[PDB]
Amino acid sequence: EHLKREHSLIKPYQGVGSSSMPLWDFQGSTILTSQYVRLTPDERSKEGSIWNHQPCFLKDWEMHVHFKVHGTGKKNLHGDGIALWYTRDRLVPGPVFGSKDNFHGLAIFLDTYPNDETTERVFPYISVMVNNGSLSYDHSKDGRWTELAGCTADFRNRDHDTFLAVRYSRGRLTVMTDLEDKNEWKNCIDITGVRLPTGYYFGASAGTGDLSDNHDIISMKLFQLMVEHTIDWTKIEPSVNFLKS
Ligand SMILES: [Ca+2]
Ligand SMILES: [Cl-]
Ligand SMILES: [Cl-]
Ligand SMILES: [Cl-]
Ligand SMILES: [Cl-]
Ligand SMILES: [Cl-]
Ligand SMILES: [Cl-]
């Protein structure tokens, strides 16, 4: 296998009911059960996260997340969503799906609720953001101003398992979904020129406001990609290069 166990969360969770080294720190509203990590309960005004206990120095990787978002809210009344992170800092709660704003690195947002009254998107909506510390995620507008790419995605209250994959290698960032019980990865996002350093932390977070949902992480499995390279990679500033019009 090219599984990197130390950057993964897999049942039975390491160090849970044992003297073993835990591989994750659990923060905020997060609660830990034998069959899932629940970042937030279906309760209002919650912020919870899980952060890999050590930084990841892989240059080429692919993270598979088995998650579940589910709740009893009537009509459209649920929120806020989950964020997956590969960032400089860790463990700090905030308004960005339970984690700090003005972050450094990569976010993948699984946004369940249209905060934006004049949105032109259909929700839930998965998108990516790359940040150098300067940008704020505008939650009130579902991050309209800072979205690199995204896709609509039906992932709440499904009768079968839902998964997400995030692959990063040689500047190419690909997000794929498996939401329709097809045992297939469907493309959501595929962009190039994404610059990220090594030495950042994997984490996941969720938040709730006046609207809520259960936001569960079942597993996160990080794979090392065997990719050739021919620079101090820890000093790369998070950024994106853009093909000219
Ligand atoms: Ca939203
Ligand atoms: Cl684990
Ligand atoms: Cl509540
Ligand atoms: Cl924004
Ligand atoms: Cl929905
Ligand atoms: Cl379904
Ligand atoms: Cl899908």
From Swiss-Prot:
Disulfide bonds: C151-C188
Tissues expressing the protein: Expressed in kidney, liver, intestine, lung, spleen and heart. Low expression in brain.
Keyword S-adenosyl-L-methionine: no
Cofactor: record remark: Binds 2 calcium ions per subunit.
Cofactor(s), by name: Ca(2+)
Gene Ontology, cellular component aspect: cell surface; COPI-coated vesicle; cytoplasmic vesicle; endoplasmic reticulum-Golgi intermediate compartment; exocytic vesicle; extracellular space; Golgi apparatus; Golgi membrane
Compartments where found: Golgi apparatus membrane
GO molecular function terms attached to this record: D-mannose binding; heat shock protein binding; metal ion binding
L-type lectin-like domain sequence ranges: 1-225
GO biological process, one term: positive regulation of phagocytosis
Chain sites annotated for binding Ca(2+): D111, Y113, N115, D142
Parts of the chain on the Lumenal side: 1-245
Keyword GTP-binding: no
Positions glycosylated per UniProt: N132
Residues involved in a carbohydrate binding: S45, D80, Y113, P114, N115, H139, G209, D210, L211
Topology class, membrane: Single-pass type I membrane protein
Domain of life: Eukaryota
Keyword terms of this UniProt record: Calcium, Disulfide bond, Glycoprotein, Golgi apparatus, Lectin, Membrane, Metal-binding, Protein transport, Signal, Transmembrane, Transmembrane helix, Transport
Quaternary structure (record): Monomer.
Record function comment: Plays a role as an intracellular lectin in the early secretory pathway. Interacts with N-acetyl-D-galactosamine and high-mannose type glycans and may also bind to O-linked glycans. Involved in the transport and sorting of glycoproteins carrying high mannose-type glycans.
UniProt-recorded name of the protein: Vesicular integral-membrane protein VIP36
Annotated organism of origin: Canis lupus familiaris (Dog)
Whole-protein residues included: 52 to 301 of 356
